[PDB]
Design an enzyme around this catalytic site. Sequence first.
Site, short mmCIF file in Angstrom:
data_model
loop_
_atom_site.label_atom_id
_atom_site.label_comp_id
_atom_site.label_asym_id
_atom_site.label_seq_id
_atom_site.Cartn_x
_atom_site.Cartn_y
_atom_site.Cartn_z
N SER A 10 0.77 -1.19 0.02
CA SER A 10 -0.12 0.12 0.06
C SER A 10 0.80 1.13 -0.01
O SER A 10 0.58 2.17 -0.97
CB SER A 10 -1.10 0.00 1.09
OG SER A 10 -2.08 -0.82 0.67
N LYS A 53 -11.05 -4.65 10.16
CA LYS A 53 -11.94 -3.91 9.36
C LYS A 53 -13.34 -3.48 10.26
O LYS A 53 -13.90 -2.48 9.98
CB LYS A 53 -12.15 -4.40 7.94
CG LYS A 53 -11.10 -4.32 7.30
CD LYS A 53 -11.24 -4.88 5.77
CE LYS A 53 -10.10 -4.77 4.75
NZ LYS A 53 -10.38 -5.63 3.68
N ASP A 58 -13.22 -1.86 -1.30
CA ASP A 58 -12.38 -3.44 -1.80
C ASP A 58 -13.53 -3.57 -2.94
O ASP A 58 -13.09 -4.05 -3.92
CB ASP A 58 -12.79 -4.28 -0.77
CG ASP A 58 -11.49 -4.22 0.55
OD1 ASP A 58 -12.08 -4.29 1.77
OD2 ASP A 58 -10.34 -3.74 -0.11
N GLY A 109 -16.39 -12.17 4.85
CA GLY A 109 -16.07 -10.53 4.84
C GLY A 109 -15.76 -10.07 3.45
O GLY A 109 -16.16 -9.22 2.95
N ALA A 110 -14.80 -11.06 2.80
CA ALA A 110 -14.39 -10.51 1.49
C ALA A 110 -15.64 -10.49 0.39
O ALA A 110 -16.03 -9.61 -0.37
CB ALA A 110 -13.19 -11.42 0.79
N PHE A 131 -24.16 -24.45 3.09
CA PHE A 131 -25.32 -23.65 2.65
C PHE A 131 -25.84 -22.23 3.40
O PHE A 131 -26.03 -21.15 2.83
CB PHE A 131 -26.57 -24.45 2.13
CG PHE A 131 -27.69 -23.64 1.82
CD1 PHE A 131 -27.71 -23.45 0.43
CD2 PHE A 131 -28.65 -23.31 2.46
CE1 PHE A 131 -28.81 -22.58 0.07
CE2 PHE A 131 -29.85 -22.48 2.12
CZ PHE A 131 -29.98 -22.25 0.96
#
Lengths: 270, 269
Positions: free
Chosen positions: A16, A65, A102, A129-130, A153
Amino acid sequence: IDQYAVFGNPINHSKSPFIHTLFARQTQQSMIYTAQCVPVDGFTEAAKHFFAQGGRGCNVTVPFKEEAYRFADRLTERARLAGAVNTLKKLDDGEILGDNTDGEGLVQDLLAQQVLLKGATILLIGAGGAARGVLKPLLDQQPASITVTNRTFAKAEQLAELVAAYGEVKAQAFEQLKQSYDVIINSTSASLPAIDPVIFSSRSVCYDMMYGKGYTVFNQWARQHGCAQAIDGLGMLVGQAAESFMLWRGLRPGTKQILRELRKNLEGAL
Amino acid sequence: QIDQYAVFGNPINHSKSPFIHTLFARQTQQSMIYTAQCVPVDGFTEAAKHFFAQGGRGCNVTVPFKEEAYRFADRLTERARLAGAVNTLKKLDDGEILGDNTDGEGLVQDLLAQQVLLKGATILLIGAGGAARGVLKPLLDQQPASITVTNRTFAKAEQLAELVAAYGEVKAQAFEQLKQSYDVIINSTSGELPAIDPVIFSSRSVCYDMMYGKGYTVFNQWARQHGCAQAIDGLGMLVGQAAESFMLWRGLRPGTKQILRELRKNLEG
Ligand code: NA
Ligand code: NA
Protein backbone atom coordinates in the site's frame (compact mmCIF):
# COMPACT_ATOMS: atom_id res chain seq x y z
CA ILE A 1 2.84 17.35 3.97
CA ASP A 2 -0.49 15.61 4.63
CA GLN A 3 -0.14 12.26 6.47
CA TYR A 4 -1.87 9.02 5.38
CA ALA A 5 -1.21 5.45 6.47
CA VAL A 6 -2.12 1.80 6.32
CA PHE A 7 -2.81 0.03 9.67
CA GLY A 8 -2.45 -3.67 9.85
CA ASN A 9 -0.99 -6.21 7.51
CA PRO A 10 -2.23 -9.81 7.49
CA ILE A 11 0.83 -10.83 5.44
CA ASN A 12 4.59 -10.14 5.74
CA HIS A 13 5.00 -7.81 2.71
CA SER A 14 3.64 -4.20 2.33
CA LYS A 15 2.36 -2.79 -1.04
CA SER A 16 0.00 0.00 0.00
CA PRO A 17 2.71 2.59 0.73
CA PHE A 18 4.35 1.79 -2.65
CA ILE A 19 1.04 2.20 -4.49
CA HIS A 20 -0.10 5.41 -2.76
CA THR A 21 3.35 6.98 -2.94
CA LEU A 22 3.21 6.48 -6.71
CA PHE A 23 -0.37 7.81 -6.95
CA ALA A 24 0.91 10.93 -5.06
CA ARG A 25 3.84 11.22 -7.49
CA GLN A 26 1.54 10.97 -10.52
CA THR A 27 -0.79 13.67 -9.22
CA GLN A 28 1.83 15.84 -7.50
CA GLN A 29 0.18 15.59 -4.08
CA SER A 30 2.04 16.92 -1.04
CA MET A 31 1.46 13.86 1.07
CA ILE A 32 3.11 10.88 2.64
CA TYR A 33 1.62 7.40 3.03
CA THR A 34 3.34 5.12 5.50
CA ALA A 35 2.73 1.75 7.02
CA GLN A 36 1.79 2.35 10.69
CA CYS A 37 1.81 -0.35 13.31
CA VAL A 38 -1.17 -1.35 15.32
CA PRO A 39 0.25 -1.24 18.86
CA VAL A 40 -0.33 -4.15 21.26
CA ASP A 41 -3.29 -2.33 22.92
CA GLY A 42 -5.21 -2.18 19.67
CA PHE A 43 -6.44 -0.48 16.58
CA THR A 44 -8.92 1.94 18.10
CA GLU A 45 -6.23 3.55 20.26
CA ALA A 46 -3.85 3.68 17.25
CA ALA A 47 -6.52 5.37 15.13
CA LYS A 48 -7.33 7.89 17.83
CA HIS A 49 -3.67 8.82 18.17
CA PHE A 50 -3.17 8.97 14.41
CA PHE A 51 -5.98 11.41 13.81
CA ALA A 52 -5.16 13.50 16.93
CA GLN A 53 -1.60 14.00 15.66
CA GLY A 54 -2.76 15.37 12.31
CA GLY A 55 -3.47 12.25 10.22
CA ARG A 56 -5.85 12.81 7.30
CA GLY A 57 -6.77 9.31 6.30
CA CYS A 58 -5.84 5.70 6.56
CA ASN A 59 -6.44 2.26 5.15
CA VAL A 60 -7.23 -0.64 7.47
CA THR A 61 -6.53 -4.27 6.76
CA VAL A 62 -7.97 -7.49 8.04
CA PRO A 63 -8.69 -8.33 10.80
CA PHE A 64 -9.28 -4.76 11.93
CA LYS A 65 -12.01 -3.69 9.43
CA GLU A 66 -14.94 -4.30 11.76
CA GLU A 67 -13.24 -2.35 14.48
CA ALA A 68 -12.68 0.50 11.95
CA TYR A 69 -16.42 0.30 11.11
CA ARG A 70 -17.25 0.90 14.77
CA PHE A 71 -14.62 3.65 15.07
CA ALA A 72 -16.04 5.78 12.25
CA ASP A 73 -18.53 8.53 13.05
CA ARG A 74 -20.19 8.25 9.63
CA LEU A 75 -20.27 5.54 6.98
CA THR A 76 -20.65 5.39 3.23
CA GLU A 77 -23.38 3.18 1.81
CA ARG A 78 -20.92 0.51 0.74
CA ALA A 79 -19.21 0.50 4.13
CA ARG A 80 -22.47 0.21 6.04
CA LEU A 81 -23.61 -2.68 3.83
CA ALA A 82 -20.18 -4.39 4.01
CA GLY A 83 -20.15 -4.20 7.82
CA ALA A 84 -16.48 -3.36 7.54
CA VAL A 85 -14.32 -0.33 6.77
CA ASN A 86 -10.99 -0.38 4.88
CA THR A 87 -10.71 3.40 4.52
CA LEU A 88 -11.02 6.18 7.08
CA LYS A 89 -11.03 9.90 6.23
CA LYS A 90 -10.94 12.91 8.52
CA LEU A 91 -13.56 15.38 7.31
CA ASP A 92 -13.29 19.19 7.45
CA ASP A 93 -15.40 19.19 10.67
CA GLY A 94 -13.23 16.55 12.39
CA GLU A 95 -15.74 13.73 11.89
CA ILE A 96 -14.27 10.46 10.72
CA LEU A 97 -15.84 8.94 7.63
CA GLY A 98 -15.57 5.22 7.05
CA ASP A 99 -15.62 3.76 3.53
CA ASN A 100 -15.02 0.33 2.00
CA THR A 101 -13.31 0.40 -1.38
CA ASP A 102 -12.62 -3.33 -1.80
CA GLY A 103 -15.68 -4.08 -3.94
CA GLU A 104 -15.40 -1.04 -6.14
CA GLY A 105 -11.72 -1.89 -6.75
CA LEU A 106 -12.79 -5.37 -7.85
CA VAL A 107 -15.40 -3.90 -10.16
CA GLN A 108 -13.00 -1.43 -11.72
CA ASP A 109 -10.38 -4.15 -12.31
CA LEU A 110 -12.97 -6.40 -13.93
CA LEU A 111 -14.03 -3.48 -16.16
CA ALA A 112 -10.36 -2.66 -16.95
CA GLN A 113 -10.05 -6.25 -18.17
CA GLN A 114 -13.09 -5.75 -20.42
CA VAL A 115 -15.30 -8.13 -18.47
CA LEU A 116 -18.99 -7.55 -19.16
CA LEU A 117 -20.92 -7.37 -15.85
CA LYS A 118 -24.21 -5.87 -17.06
CA GLY A 119 -26.65 -8.78 -17.58
CA ALA A 120 -24.02 -11.34 -16.61
CA THR A 121 -24.46 -14.36 -14.36
CA ILE A 122 -21.95 -14.18 -11.51
CA LEU A 123 -20.83 -16.93 -9.16
CA LEU A 124 -19.29 -15.61 -5.92
CA ILE A 125 -17.29 -18.28 -4.10
CA GLY A 126 -17.14 -17.67 -0.40
CA ALA A 127 -19.57 -16.01 2.02
CA GLY A 128 -17.13 -14.34 4.39
CA GLY A 129 -16.12 -10.66 4.84
CA ALA A 130 -14.39 -10.50 1.46
CA ALA A 131 -17.54 -11.74 -0.30
CA ARG A 132 -19.85 -9.51 1.74
CA GLY A 133 -17.81 -6.44 0.87
CA VAL A 134 -18.07 -6.84 -2.86
CA LEU A 135 -21.76 -7.62 -3.24
CA LYS A 136 -23.30 -4.13 -3.40
CA PRO A 137 -20.64 -2.78 -5.80
CA LEU A 138 -21.24 -5.78 -8.10
CA LEU A 139 -25.02 -5.43 -7.87
CA ASP A 140 -24.67 -1.75 -8.85
CA GLN A 141 -23.30 -3.02 -12.19
CA GLN A 142 -26.66 -4.63 -12.98
CA PRO A 143 -25.78 -8.28 -13.39
CA ALA A 144 -28.55 -10.67 -14.30
CA SER A 145 -27.83 -12.49 -11.04
CA ILE A 146 -25.26 -13.27 -8.37
CA THR A 147 -25.02 -16.74 -6.85
CA VAL A 148 -23.31 -16.89 -3.49
CA THR A 149 -21.76 -20.26 -2.66
CA ASN A 150 -19.96 -21.74 0.33
CA ARG A 151 -19.00 -25.21 1.64
CA THR A 152 -22.02 -25.02 3.96
CA PHE A 153 -25.30 -23.56 2.54
CA ALA A 154 -26.39 -21.50 5.61
CA LYS A 155 -23.52 -19.00 5.49
CA ALA A 156 -24.21 -18.41 1.79
CA GLU A 157 -27.98 -18.06 2.45
CA GLN A 158 -27.35 -15.51 5.20
CA LEU A 159 -25.30 -13.33 2.89
CA ALA A 160 -27.84 -13.58 0.03
CA GLU A 161 -30.58 -12.48 2.54
CA LEU A 162 -28.64 -9.40 3.47
CA VAL A 163 -28.51 -8.13 -0.13
CA ALA A 164 -31.77 -9.57 -1.40
CA ALA A 165 -33.42 -6.16 -1.91
CA TYR A 166 -30.64 -5.00 -4.25
CA GLY A 167 -30.95 -7.47 -7.08
CA GLU A 168 -31.27 -11.15 -7.92
CA VAL A 169 -29.07 -12.91 -5.37
CA LYS A 170 -29.16 -16.69 -5.01
CA ALA A 171 -27.50 -19.06 -2.55
CA GLN A 172 -26.21 -22.52 -3.31
CA ALA A 173 -23.93 -24.95 -1.46
CA PHE A 174 -20.72 -26.05 -3.36
CA GLU A 175 -22.24 -29.51 -4.00
CA GLN A 176 -25.42 -28.07 -5.69
CA LEU A 177 -23.55 -26.10 -8.37
CA LYS A 178 -24.43 -27.71 -11.73
CA GLN A 179 -24.46 -25.02 -14.44
CA SER A 180 -21.94 -22.59 -15.95
CA TYR A 181 -21.52 -18.89 -15.09
CA ASP A 182 -20.33 -15.87 -17.09
CA VAL A 183 -18.13 -14.57 -14.29
CA ILE A 184 -16.69 -16.66 -11.43
CA ILE A 185 -15.13 -14.83 -8.48
CA ASN A 186 -13.11 -16.59 -5.82
CA SER A 187 -13.14 -14.67 -2.52
CA THR A 188 -11.91 -17.55 -0.36
CA SER A 189 -8.44 -17.84 1.03
CA ALA A 190 -6.15 -20.70 0.07
CA SER A 191 -6.89 -24.04 1.84
CA LEU A 192 -9.59 -26.67 -4.05
CA PRO A 193 -13.31 -26.23 -3.37
CA ALA A 194 -15.55 -29.28 -3.84
CA ILE A 195 -17.23 -27.71 -6.85
CA ASP A 196 -18.16 -29.30 -10.17
CA PRO A 197 -15.92 -27.77 -12.90
CA VAL A 198 -19.05 -27.43 -15.08
CA ILE A 199 -19.16 -23.88 -13.57
CA PHE A 200 -16.55 -22.98 -16.23
CA SER A 201 -17.93 -22.50 -19.78
CA SER A 202 -16.21 -21.59 -23.11
CA ARG A 203 -16.86 -17.88 -22.51
CA SER A 204 -16.52 -17.83 -18.68
CA VAL A 205 -14.19 -15.38 -16.98
CA CYS A 206 -12.56 -16.30 -13.70
CA TYR A 207 -11.35 -13.78 -11.15
CA ASP A 208 -9.29 -14.84 -8.13
CA MET A 209 -8.83 -12.35 -5.27
CA MET A 210 -5.57 -14.08 -4.44
CA TYR A 211 -2.44 -13.13 -6.34
CA GLY A 212 1.12 -14.22 -6.85
CA LYS A 213 3.79 -15.17 -9.30
CA GLY A 214 2.45 -17.15 -12.25
CA TYR A 215 -1.07 -18.57 -11.78
CA THR A 216 -2.82 -19.02 -8.45
CA VAL A 217 -3.90 -22.53 -7.39
CA PHE A 218 -7.52 -21.62 -8.09
CA ASN A 219 -6.78 -20.05 -11.46
CA GLN A 220 -4.66 -23.07 -12.50
CA TRP A 221 -7.70 -25.24 -11.77
CA ALA A 222 -10.02 -22.87 -13.67
CA ARG A 223 -7.66 -22.84 -16.65
CA GLN A 224 -7.32 -26.67 -16.71
CA HIS A 225 -11.13 -26.84 -16.82
CA GLY A 226 -11.53 -24.51 -19.81
CA CYS A 227 -11.78 -20.97 -18.45
CA ALA A 228 -11.80 -18.28 -21.21
CA GLN A 229 -9.68 -15.95 -19.02
CA ALA A 230 -8.22 -16.17 -15.53
CA ILE A 231 -7.50 -12.88 -13.77
CA ASP A 232 -5.76 -12.59 -10.41
CA GLY A 233 -6.35 -10.09 -7.62
CA LEU A 234 -3.39 -7.76 -8.06
CA GLY A 235 -5.62 -5.31 -10.01
CA MET A 236 -8.20 -5.34 -7.20
CA LEU A 237 -5.47 -4.27 -4.77
CA VAL A 238 -4.54 -1.30 -6.98
CA GLY A 239 -8.19 -0.54 -7.76
CA GLN A 240 -9.27 -0.40 -4.11
CA ALA A 241 -6.26 1.79 -3.39
CA ALA A 242 -7.23 4.16 -6.24
CA GLU A 243 -10.77 4.49 -4.78
CA SER A 244 -9.30 5.36 -1.40
CA PHE A 245 -6.97 7.91 -2.99
CA MET A 246 -9.87 9.49 -4.91
CA LEU A 247 -11.86 9.76 -1.67
CA TRP A 248 -8.99 11.48 0.13
CA ARG A 249 -7.58 13.70 -2.63
CA GLY A 250 -10.41 14.07 -5.20
CA LEU A 251 -8.05 13.09 -8.01
CA ARG A 252 -8.12 9.84 -10.03
CA PRO A 253 -4.68 8.31 -10.43
CA GLY A 254 -3.34 5.98 -13.15
CA THR A 255 -4.00 2.47 -11.98
CA LYS A 256 -2.78 0.49 -14.98
CA GLN A 257 0.76 1.89 -14.93
CA ILE A 258 1.08 1.02 -11.22
CA LEU A 259 -0.39 -2.48 -11.69
CA ARG A 260 2.24 -3.03 -14.42
CA GLU A 261 5.07 -2.18 -12.01
CA LEU A 262 3.67 -4.38 -9.25
CA ARG A 263 3.50 -7.23 -11.72
CA LYS A 264 7.16 -6.60 -12.71
CA ASN A 265 8.11 -6.76 -9.02
CA LEU A 266 6.23 -10.06 -8.51
CA GLU A 267 8.07 -11.55 -11.49
CA GLY A 268 11.50 -10.46 -10.04
CA ALA A 269 12.11 -6.62 -10.30
CA LEU A 270 14.61 -7.33 -13.09
CA GLN B 1 12.64 2.43 -13.02
CA ILE B 2 11.35 2.88 -9.54
CA ASP B 3 14.03 0.98 -7.61
CA GLN B 4 12.70 0.24 -4.11
CA TYR B 5 14.07 1.72 -0.92
CA ALA B 6 12.48 2.04 2.55
CA VAL B 7 12.96 2.91 6.19
CA PHE B 8 12.04 0.33 8.82
CA GLY B 9 11.50 1.28 12.44
CA ASN B 10 8.99 1.43 15.29
CA PRO B 11 6.91 3.47 15.70
CA ILE B 12 8.20 5.86 12.96
CA ASN B 13 4.93 7.79 13.23
CA HIS B 14 6.09 11.04 11.48
CA SER B 15 8.85 9.96 9.08
CA LYS B 16 10.43 12.56 6.85
CA SER B 17 12.72 10.13 4.98
CA PRO B 18 10.31 9.50 2.08
CA PHE B 19 10.28 13.26 1.33
CA ILE B 20 14.06 13.53 1.72
CA HIS B 21 14.88 10.69 -0.66
CA THR B 22 12.22 11.65 -3.17
CA LEU B 23 13.90 15.07 -3.51
CA PHE B 24 17.36 13.53 -3.56
CA ALA B 25 16.32 11.21 -6.40
CA ARG B 26 14.71 13.96 -8.47
CA GLN B 27 17.76 16.15 -8.04
CA THR B 28 20.21 13.43 -9.04
CA GLN B 29 18.13 11.79 -11.77
CA GLN B 30 17.68 8.50 -9.98
CA SER B 31 14.53 6.50 -10.63
CA MET B 32 13.48 5.22 -7.23
CA ILE B 33 10.80 5.10 -4.61
CA TYR B 34 11.25 5.38 -0.84
CA THR B 35 8.57 4.39 1.68
CA ALA B 36 8.34 4.41 5.50
CA GLN B 37 7.26 1.13 7.07
CA CYS B 38 6.60 0.58 10.74
CA VAL B 39 7.29 -3.02 11.67
CA PRO B 40 6.20 -4.66 14.91
CA VAL B 41 9.02 -4.95 17.45
CA ASP B 42 9.29 -8.72 16.86
CA GLY B 43 9.10 -8.53 13.06
CA PHE B 44 12.17 -6.79 11.68
CA THR B 45 14.12 -9.75 10.29
CA GLU B 46 11.10 -11.23 8.48
CA ALA B 47 10.12 -7.78 7.14
CA ALA B 48 13.61 -7.14 5.81
CA LYS B 49 13.85 -10.60 4.25
CA HIS B 50 10.56 -10.08 2.40
CA PHE B 51 11.48 -6.56 1.35
CA PHE B 52 14.67 -7.81 -0.31
CA ALA B 53 12.96 -10.92 -1.71
CA GLN B 54 10.42 -8.68 -3.51
CA GLY B 55 13.16 -6.62 -5.16
CA GLY B 56 14.23 -4.07 -2.52
CA ARG B 57 17.58 -2.42 -3.19
CA GLY B 58 18.27 -0.84 0.16
CA CYS B 59 16.77 0.45 3.39
CA ASN B 60 17.39 2.62 6.37
CA VAL B 61 16.88 1.09 9.77
CA THR B 62 15.96 3.20 12.80
CA VAL B 63 15.24 2.39 16.50
CA PRO B 64 14.68 -0.16 17.81
CA PHE B 65 16.18 -2.32 15.05
CA LYS B 66 19.74 -1.09 14.49
CA GLU B 67 21.46 -3.87 16.41
CA GLU B 68 19.22 -6.50 14.79
CA ALA B 69 20.15 -5.00 11.36
CA TYR B 70 23.82 -5.44 12.32
CA ARG B 71 23.11 -9.17 12.80
CA PHE B 72 21.01 -9.40 9.64
CA ALA B 73 23.70 -8.01 7.33
CA ASP B 74 25.88 -10.53 5.49
CA ARG B 75 28.82 -8.14 5.72
CA LEU B 76 29.57 -4.93 7.64
CA THR B 77 31.49 -1.84 6.76
CA GLU B 78 34.30 -0.92 9.17
CA ARG B 79 32.34 2.07 10.48
CA ALA B 80 29.28 -0.14 11.16
CA ARG B 81 31.42 -2.77 12.86
CA LEU B 82 32.88 -0.06 15.14
CA ALA B 83 29.42 1.48 15.71
CA GLY B 84 27.95 -1.89 16.75
CA ALA B 85 24.77 -1.04 14.83
CA VAL B 86 23.53 -0.65 11.27
CA ASN B 87 21.27 2.11 9.97
CA THR B 88 21.67 1.36 6.28
CA LEU B 89 21.35 -1.93 4.41
CA LYS B 90 22.23 -2.29 0.74
CA LYS B 91 21.65 -5.15 -1.65
CA LEU B 92 24.90 -5.58 -3.53
CA ASP B 93 25.29 -6.83 -7.08
CA ASP B 94 26.66 -10.19 -5.69
CA GLY B 95 23.42 -10.84 -3.72
CA GLU B 96 24.98 -10.02 -0.37
CA ILE B 97 23.35 -7.54 2.00
CA LEU B 98 25.86 -4.93 3.22
CA GLY B 99 25.31 -3.17 6.56
CA ASP B 100 26.61 0.38 7.04
CA ASN B 101 26.21 3.13 9.56
CA THR B 102 25.81 6.66 8.23
CA ASP B 103 24.58 8.33 11.43
CA GLY B 104 28.01 9.51 12.54
CA GLU B 105 28.96 10.86 9.18
CA GLY B 106 25.55 12.56 8.97
CA LEU B 107 26.09 14.29 12.28
CA VAL B 108 29.60 15.40 11.35
CA GLN B 109 28.50 16.76 7.97
CA ASP B 110 25.65 18.67 9.60
CA LEU B 111 27.94 20.23 12.19
CA LEU B 112 30.50 21.13 9.56
CA ALA B 113 27.98 22.56 7.06
CA GLN B 114 26.44 24.65 9.85
CA GLN B 115 29.94 26.01 10.43
CA VAL B 116 30.64 24.53 13.81
CA LEU B 117 34.42 24.38 14.15
CA LEU B 118 35.16 20.82 15.34
CA LYS B 119 38.89 20.97 14.69
CA GLY B 120 40.56 21.98 17.92
CA ALA B 121 37.27 22.00 19.83
CA THR B 122 36.54 20.56 23.27
CA ILE B 123 33.47 18.37 22.80
CA LEU B 124 31.15 16.94 25.44
CA LEU B 125 29.08 13.96 24.24
CA ILE B 126 26.13 13.24 26.56
CA GLY B 127 25.08 9.64 26.48
CA ALA B 128 27.03 6.41 25.87
CA GLY B 129 24.29 4.40 24.16
CA GLY B 130 24.08 3.31 20.55
CA ALA B 131 23.50 6.81 19.27
CA ALA B 132 26.72 8.06 20.92
CA ARG B 133 28.69 5.02 19.84
CA GLY B 134 27.71 5.55 16.20
CA VAL B 135 29.03 9.12 16.09
CA LEU B 136 32.17 8.89 18.21
CA LYS B 137 34.82 7.83 15.66
CA PRO B 138 33.57 10.22 12.95
CA LEU B 139 33.82 13.06 15.48
CA LEU B 140 37.37 12.03 16.49
CA ASP B 141 38.36 12.01 12.87
CA GLN B 142 37.76 15.80 12.76
CA GLN B 143 40.67 16.32 15.15
CA PRO B 144 38.95 17.92 18.08
CA ALA B 145 41.07 19.00 21.05
CA SER B 146 39.15 16.38 23.04
CA ILE B 147 35.94 14.44 23.37
CA THR B 148 34.55 13.74 26.84
CA VAL B 149 31.91 11.00 26.95
CA THR B 150 29.42 11.02 29.84
CA ASN B 151 26.42 8.85 30.65
CA ARG B 152 23.89 8.52 33.48
CA THR B 153 25.54 5.12 34.10
CA PHE B 154 29.32 5.70 34.15
CA ALA B 155 30.39 2.23 33.17
CA LYS B 156 28.96 2.59 29.65
CA ALA B 157 30.89 5.86 29.11
CA GLU B 158 34.16 4.21 30.14
CA GLN B 159 33.46 1.26 27.82
CA LEU B 160 32.81 3.63 24.93
CA ALA B 161 35.96 5.69 25.59
CA GLU B 162 38.01 2.45 25.66
CA LEU B 163 36.53 1.29 22.37
CA VAL B 164 37.90 4.36 20.41
CA ALA B 165 41.10 5.27 22.29
CA ALA B 166 43.22 4.79 19.16
CA TYR B 167 41.41 7.47 17.14
CA GLY B 168 41.94 10.57 19.28
CA GLU B 169 41.73 12.40 22.61
CA VAL B 170 38.70 10.66 24.42
CA LYS B 171 37.84 10.75 28.15
CA ALA B 172 34.98 9.32 30.20
CA GLN B 173 33.50 11.32 33.08
CA ALA B 174 30.52 10.89 35.38
CA PHE B 175 27.80 13.53 35.17
CA GLU B 176 28.89 14.97 38.54
CA GLN B 177 32.51 15.33 37.50
CA LEU B 178 31.57 17.86 34.80
CA LYS B 179 32.72 21.23 36.13
CA GLN B 180 33.74 23.32 33.21
CA SER B 181 32.41 24.55 29.93
CA TYR B 182 32.95 23.10 26.46
CA ASP B 183 33.14 24.46 22.91
CA VAL B 184 30.57 21.92 21.66
CA ILE B 185 27.98 19.95 23.64
CA ILE B 186 26.15 17.12 21.89
CA ASN B 187 23.10 15.43 23.40
CA SER B 188 22.69 11.87 22.12
CA THR B 189 20.05 10.79 24.61
CA SER B 190 16.42 10.43 23.53
CA GLY B 191 11.54 16.68 29.58
CA GLU B 192 13.68 14.89 32.10
CA LEU B 193 16.96 16.61 31.44
CA PRO B 194 20.26 15.07 32.47
CA ALA B 195 21.32 15.92 35.97
CA ILE B 196 24.47 17.83 35.01
CA ASP B 197 25.77 21.18 36.32
CA PRO B 198 24.82 23.81 33.71
CA VAL B 199 28.35 25.21 34.13
CA ILE B 200 28.95 23.08 31.01
CA PHE B 201 27.35 25.83 28.91
CA SER B 202 29.37 28.92 28.07
CA SER B 203 28.04 31.89 26.13
CA ARG B 204 30.50 30.65 23.47
CA SER B 205 29.31 27.04 23.49
CA VAL B 206 27.53 25.46 20.57
CA CYS B 207 24.93 22.92 21.61
CA TYR B 208 23.60 20.20 19.36
CA ASP B 209 20.65 17.93 20.18
CA MET B 210 20.14 14.79 18.09
CA MET B 211 16.44 15.22 18.86
CA TYR B 212 14.32 17.56 16.78
CA GLY B 213 10.81 18.87 16.45
CA LYS B 214 8.75 22.02 16.41
CA GLY B 215 10.25 24.81 18.46
CA TYR B 216 13.09 24.11 20.90
CA THR B 217 13.75 20.63 22.27
CA VAL B 218 13.80 20.42 26.05
CA PHE B 219 17.58 19.98 25.98
CA ASN B 220 18.02 23.02 23.72
CA GLN B 221 15.66 25.04 25.91
CA TRP B 222 17.90 24.22 28.90
CA ALA B 223 21.05 25.12 26.97
CA ARG B 224 19.51 28.44 25.93
CA GLN B 225 18.46 29.28 29.48
CA HIS B 226 22.11 28.88 30.40
CA GLY B 227 23.48 31.19 27.73
CA CYS B 228 24.69 28.88 25.01
CA ALA B 229 26.03 30.56 21.86
CA GLN B 230 23.77 28.65 19.43
CA ALA B 231 21.48 25.62 19.96
CA ILE B 232 20.94 23.35 16.98
CA ASP B 233 18.57 20.39 16.70
CA GLY B 234 18.99 17.10 14.86
CA LEU B 235 17.04 17.80 11.71
CA GLY B 236 20.30 18.33 9.82
CA MET B 237 21.71 15.05 11.14
CA LEU B 238 18.66 13.28 9.72
CA VAL B 239 19.20 14.91 6.36
CA GLY B 240 22.95 14.36 6.50
CA GLN B 241 22.80 10.68 7.35
CA ALA B 242 20.19 10.33 4.58
CA ALA B 243 22.60 11.90 2.03
CA GLU B 244 25.34 9.44 3.01
CA SER B 245 22.97 6.50 2.70
CA PHE B 246 21.91 7.77 -0.72
CA MET B 247 25.53 8.02 -1.83
CA LEU B 248 26.14 4.46 -0.69
CA TRP B 249 23.11 3.24 -2.61
CA ARG B 250 23.37 5.29 -5.79
CA GLY B 251 27.01 6.39 -6.00
CA LEU B 252 26.52 10.12 -6.00
CA ARG B 253 26.10 12.64 -3.17
CA PRO B 254 22.90 14.72 -3.28
CA GLY B 255 22.53 18.29 -2.14
CA THR B 256 20.63 18.91 1.07
CA LYS B 257 19.77 22.63 1.01
CA GLN B 258 16.27 22.58 -0.43
CA ILE B 259 15.33 19.58 1.72
CA LEU B 260 16.53 21.12 4.99
CA ARG B 261 14.77 24.42 4.28
CA GLU B 262 11.48 22.67 3.44
CA LEU B 263 11.57 20.23 6.36
CA ARG B 264 12.27 23.09 8.75
CA LYS B 265 9.36 25.08 7.32
CA ASN B 266 7.08 22.09 7.66
CA LEU B 267 8.04 21.38 11.27
CA GLU B 268 7.05 24.92 12.19
CA GLY B 269 3.85 24.89 10.17
NA1 NA C 1 -1.04 17.24 -12.00
NA1 NA D 1 25.27 -11.30 9.76
